[PDB]
């Protein structure tokens, strides 16, 4: 518990809107609940990915209600910790928790991992966990009728707990806690970088909140939290040798830019840590190579998706919009313009087809990183075969529910060549059954990538149930500027100096203790000859063969790295390329 | 169990021993630069790694290490689900008073041992009565009032069993993974063990014992010096095992020669060998005549697949012996550009090892990875496959590539690739295959194949052409004259020895005190040149195989007649056999 206002949350302002109108509005306004005849809300549940801001909710509640003019209590119950071995008496424990936040009219009620302390409809297990649900259900039914007694409830799995839990009279509002997008991290992100004595430029945040997908609000402060102990290992060692207290002096440690590049290559995000990885941006070297052809390919997804205007909730907050807005005749006219906003998705389908290794699964990687706001459902071999319990019919049929519940959403498919061979056909048509039995206006993106896909196959095959008519982009190799450019950015390497490279020196001097208070020979007909040897063997390849011939020449020139006359690094460059 | 062991007690993790300084006793000493960025200090590490690696151990002395000044960190410290009862109630109960008394003795560390059996993963039955413990923990762990200065440790053999809610900033934001310990580890670890001797052991047969202990662990390496220390108890006093009452024996002259590190090694059976993949290890000393020309062949081609002896970037050992020994120097332009120009050396490391049928391929593959040392070996072979009857082929083969995934330097290994193309149903090698073409192309899985007569039919327009085999097919030939000339070299130092070179024991004269209770050998050198003749002429085009079936052979009618001088009836032996 600290002085958490709710300017230290970033990116969840409707929510921080609506719990202040619950809390303030019941008690400041009171009149406006007596002409419509309506109760205020009583209960709401925070859910979604963990490391968000549930319990961060929840404290700057508790902060915020807290000044002069005017208290609010807090009263937090953890996970089933007022249960004991004793009957009824957790039931004596919740009966007097309710009865003090009575008696009291500043008190809100909290329950961190409601999913523990109150879990489904127990089947078997008679136990005092049906007892406790159900004291629950009876206690904040109803007690006072247009009260204050306002009960949180955080989870991370929503379907875990009781739906008898989840109605409009307990538990009435149910939000989602969403994993932020790069407007949100960049907030995030400014938020713990504030009160830092040499801060920031703000590009060089647009890129870290461009680096950091998939990192939630936790995996943002730990990474914060590692650029500045890499920063204080950096300037000050001396300290990790001691077991006495040195004398070192702040201001001199400051967070550069490398310190933060060494904390994003060992902090996993929390959505990853079991998945292995996230779908990353398309890699600085093979940029070159295809980011010609994956723009195209999402302008496609910027007009079958209708992503750029986002023409519902495009601003930070509902509230806002009723501020700085004016609103606009409204029986037809709504409901005809809301019906033509959302028919602008007929289906949105892609597959992404190209010959044998040419860097679809960069492209995939890309297009993922792209499509922030997507529910991304992976339908590969590696997901769905994974359990030894589930079949590929139940896995298929789970993921694309979960693509149903969250709306925008992306099943995705990799390898569809593998795809159509491993799966069953019995697995193709469920799938191809569920693909067909949505509505037009849902925007759920079939999304695939194969490699030499015959076009019989989808026109009048297996997937010809899919419709993927017209919506075959066809991924061609590079052509000659795109491997000109992927080989100067090869030879600018071979240009650059000994004295240039970013080889670490030892120190010629030991580390202070503290108190215990020439130019290379290059001429530019070699480097030609080299950039021509290097255009006329890679003819018509594809891009896995550009990186073998990339790795296989940066090789002989990070061999000859120390080396000044460069002329026999040039002739093995060209003996190579024979 | 919360001795006076520290961190010179520990052996090989120098980089974790750094971190732990950093989130246990730095913040203590130092709460101005932690409060200079308005950070909290990491709370809370999952220990991770092969058993018999030194978590426990790390913990423990993280507890007494830290605390040799006057700011005391008392160590709470729990077993694997031990806590939760027949009812309902003291498995929350207990967990809320060890974090309060941990609260209450502000600087603490909570060690939970094999956490994987108290927060287990949420399967489908039997839900309560873990997930009821789960919650509790996850709230206490990062719940809305400051914990304080709690450190929570976990550990366990395996992190996915664990689970994911856990695995988390606030909780568990660090996963340290304790590696089997390479030589100059395993050398420090002899050194640690065997240091209050009163006769210590050389460094060259500490050395040679830390090249002898590949596939050890650091409980295996005590449990080696143990049985060592007991062998020489047997060996000086051996009275002390018959008399029921206590003798007196003196404890000096109890010296641990190599004979008792030598039988030691024969009683212990390391963590490798329990497990069902090939064990690395070098090539054994008979046919390392046979081997090593073209074993040293394919180590040159993975220093130019791999780049093991072109270090210069990755080669963060220990992060902050590197801030202190080396020395700093745009931004983008020195950096990341040279990054990506050193990680863009590895293509797409594959290799096919493709021999004739018996030509050493099971000691090839090991020698290779007793050489790729600090890589991470899975074992895609059909018994570690089947060996998990709960698992399916499938499954076993995706867990496999996505531990292979993480720890990034890693190395899938499917030995006998002809019966395993063959054995293993066609869906898995698409799937197995759509997982390695799923990867980038920077990344340091290398795919080590070794094969029995392989067609290349099969590798070029068949079920193995989408591994990209293309210039990666090694074969290995069969051996030359030179090698088999240097084996049956050897093979004749064993014939032309004498009976009195040849280790026979004793037959003590005098028993063992009781205690105080309280000819020239005829063999000439033409015959020596007949024998390695016929053995090299019998031996013509053979594979390994064959050639230790001869040398087994003759060895056993060398070994007949080991007491004989008059060597000619075994060398009429031996050329009547090769015929
Ligand atoms: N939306 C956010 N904005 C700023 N910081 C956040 C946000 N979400 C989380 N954090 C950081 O994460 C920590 C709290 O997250 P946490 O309470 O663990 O969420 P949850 O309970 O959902 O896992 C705080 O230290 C805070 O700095
Ligand atoms: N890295 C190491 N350095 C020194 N000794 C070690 C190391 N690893 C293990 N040991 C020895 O092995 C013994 C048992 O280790 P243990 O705590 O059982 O590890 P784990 O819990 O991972 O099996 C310890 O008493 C320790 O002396």
């Known amino acids: 518990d600290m002085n958490v206002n709710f300017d230290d949350i970033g990116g969840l302002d409707n929510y921080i809107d609506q719990l202040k109108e619950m809390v303030a509005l019941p008690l400041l306004y009171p009149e406006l609940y007596q002409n419509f005849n309506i109760t205020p809300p009583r209960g709401v549940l925070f859910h979604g990915p963990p490391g968000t801001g549930k319990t961060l909710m929840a404290r700057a509640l508790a902060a915020s209600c807290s000044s002069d003019e005017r208290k609010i209590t ?13 009957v009824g008496e957790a039931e004596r424990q919740l009966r007097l928790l309710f009865e003090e936040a009575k008696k009291h ?3 809100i009620i909290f329950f ?28 904040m039914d109803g007690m006072d009728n247009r009260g204050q007694v306002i009960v949180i409830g955080a989870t991370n799995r929503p379907d875990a707990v009781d739906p008898a839990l989840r109605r409009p009279g307990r538990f009435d509002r149910e939000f989602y806690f969403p994993l932020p997008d790069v407007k949100a991290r960049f907030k995030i992100l400014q938020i713990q970088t504030r009160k830092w ?48 207290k040195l004398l070192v002096d702040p201001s001199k440690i400051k967070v550069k830019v490398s310190d933060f590049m060494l904390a994003l290559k ?106 922030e706001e997507f529910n991304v459902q992976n339908l590969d071999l590696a997901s769905l075969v994974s359990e030894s319990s589930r079949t590929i019919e139940a896995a298929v049929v789970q993921s694309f529910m979960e693509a149903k519940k969250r709306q925008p959403s992306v099943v995705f498919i990799p390898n569809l060549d593998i795809w159509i061979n491993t799966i069953p056909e019995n697995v193709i048509l469920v799938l191809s059954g569920l693909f067909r039995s949505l509505q037009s206006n849902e925007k759920i993106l079939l999304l695939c990538l194969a490699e030499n896909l015959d076009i019989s196959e989808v026109k009048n095959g ?100 120390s080396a000044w006359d460069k002329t026999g690094t040039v002739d093995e460059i060209i003996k190579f390329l024979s």
């Open 197 to 244: 004595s040499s801060p920031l430029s703000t590009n060089f945040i647009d890129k870290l909140a461009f680096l950091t997908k998939g990192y939630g609000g936790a995996d943002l402060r730990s990474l914060c939290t590692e650029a500045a102990l890499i920063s204080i290992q950096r300037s000050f060692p001396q300290i990790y040798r001691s077991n006495d």
């Open 112 to 139: 961190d991992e409601i999913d523990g302390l109150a879990p489904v409809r127990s089947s078997k297990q008679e136990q005092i966990h049906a007892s406790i649900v159900s004291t629950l259900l009876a206690l």
């Open 74 to 86: 807090f009263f937090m119950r953890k996970g089933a910790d007022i249960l004991s071995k004793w």
């Open 266 to 371: 060992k902090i996993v995000p929390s959505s990853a840590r079991s998945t292995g990885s996230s779908p990353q941006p398309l890699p600085e070297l093979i940029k070159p190579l295809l980011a010609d052809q994956l723009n195209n390919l999402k302008n496609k997804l910027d007009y079958m998706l209708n992503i750029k205007d986002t023409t519902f909730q495009r601003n930070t907050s509902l509230l806002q919009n009723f501020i700085d807005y004016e609103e606009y005749s409204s029986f037809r006219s709504y409901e005809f313009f809301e019906s033509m906003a959302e028919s602008q998705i007929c289906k949105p389908r892609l597959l992404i087809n190209g010959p044998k290794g040419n860097g679809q699964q960069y492209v995939g990687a890309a297009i993922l990183n792209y499509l």
């Open 105 to 107: 009219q500043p008190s």
């Open 462 to 561: 297996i997937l010809s149930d899919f419709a993927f008519d017209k919506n075959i982009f066809q991924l061609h190799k590079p052509s000659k500027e795109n491997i000109t450019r992927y080989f100067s950015n090869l030879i600018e390497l071979l240009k650059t100096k000994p004295s240039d490279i970013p080889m670490k020196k030892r120190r010629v001097k030991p580390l202070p203790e503290l108190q215990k208070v020439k130019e290379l020979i290059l001429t530019p007909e070699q480097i030609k000859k080299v950039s021509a040897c290097l255009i006329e063997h890679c003819q018509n390849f594809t891009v896995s063969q550009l990186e073998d011939v990339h790795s296989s020449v940066a090789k002989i020139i990070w061999k000859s790295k």
